[PDB]
C-alpha cells in the first residue's frame, strides 16, 4: 500500500524489515568499520535484544541508525527513516 | 469617487513583453537563461539571479531590430509574478533523468499531483459518464 502522503509502501519496507531483523549480524558493522575480529562468532545480535527486552519487558529497542545501513538491501529504509520518520 | 486612474504602466503589454522576453538572449554560446534553468531543474540551483544588464542588453537589441527599467522602479513585483510564472510556462522538463530517491519535496508532490489527477480523471469521468498554486511547484 502506497502512502498518499509519503508514497513509502507499506508492504515491501515491512517484508524487508523482517528478515532485516532475522538476518542482522556484528559483522557487518564490522566490514564497513573495518576493525579487527568475534563477538562469539557473530550471533544474531537483533535476536539477542529482543530476547533480551521480552524477558525484561522494556518495550524500548535502542538502535543505531548505522547499524541498519550497513546491511544489504536495507538502506531505502535507512534513507525513508531520515526522510519519513513520522511512518 | 472610486478613481480608475490611467497610468502608463500595465500588464497585459507586460505580458507580450514577457512573451517575448524569453530564454533567447547571446552572451547572457547558450544563453545562460537556458542553461541554468537547466542546473534548476537538474535540482542543482535555486537562486536564477537575473541582473539588470542583459536586461538593458535584449532591450537594445529588440529595439535595433525594431520602459522596464523604469517600470519595475514602482513595484518590481509584478515582474516577480510574470517573469517567474513564464519561466514555469516556459520550463525545460526533460533537462535530466529523474529517480524516486534522488531527493524529498519533489517526487512526493508529483505523487500527490498525478494520483490526484488519475483520481479526478476518474471519479469526475465517472459523474460525467483545487488549482495547484504555482508555488506548489516553484522549487527555486
Known amino acids: 500500500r502506497i502512502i498518499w502522503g509519503t508514497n513509502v509502501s507499506i508492504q515491501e519496507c515491512t517484508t524487508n524489515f523482517r528478515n532485516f531483523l532475522m538476518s542482522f549480524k556484528y559483522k557487518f558493522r564490522k566490514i564497513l568499520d573495518e576493525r579487527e575480529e568475534n563477538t562469539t562468532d557473530e550471533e544474531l545480535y537483533y535476536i539477542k535484544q529482543l530476547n533480551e527486552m521480552r524477558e525484561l519487558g522494556t518495550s524500548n529497542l535502542n538502535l543505531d541508525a548505522r547499524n541498519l545501513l550497513a546491511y544489504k538491501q536495507t538502506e531505502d529504509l535507512y534513507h525513508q527513516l531520515l526522510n519519513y520518520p513520522q511512518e | ?115 490526484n489527477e488519475r483520481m479526478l480523471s476518474d471519479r469526475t469521468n465517472e459523474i460525467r459518464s483545487e488549482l495547484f498554486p504555482p508555488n506548489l511547484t516553484r522549487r527555486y
Open chain 2, 1 to 115: 469617487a472610486l478613481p480608475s486612474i490611467q497610468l502608463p504602466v500595465d500588464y497585459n503589454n507586460l505580458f507580450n513583453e514577457i512573451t517575448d522576453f524569453l530564454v533567447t538572449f547571446k552572451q547572457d554560446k547558450g544563453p545562460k537563461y537556458m542553461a541554468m534553468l537547466q542546473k534548476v531543474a537538474n535540482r542543482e540551483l535555486n537562486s536564477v539571479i537575473i541582473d539588470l544588464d542583459d536586461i538593458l542588453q535584449y532591450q537594445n537589441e529588440k529595439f535595433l531590430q525594431g520602459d522596464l527599467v523604469s517600470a519595475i522602479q514602482q513595484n518590481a513585483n509584478h515582474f516577480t509574478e510574470l517573469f517567474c510564472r513564464a519561466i514555469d510556462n516556459n520550463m525545460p522538463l526533460p533537462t535530466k533523468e529523474i529517480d524516486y530517491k534522488d531527493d524529498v519535496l519533489d517526487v512526493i508532490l508529483n505523487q500527490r499531483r498525478l494520483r
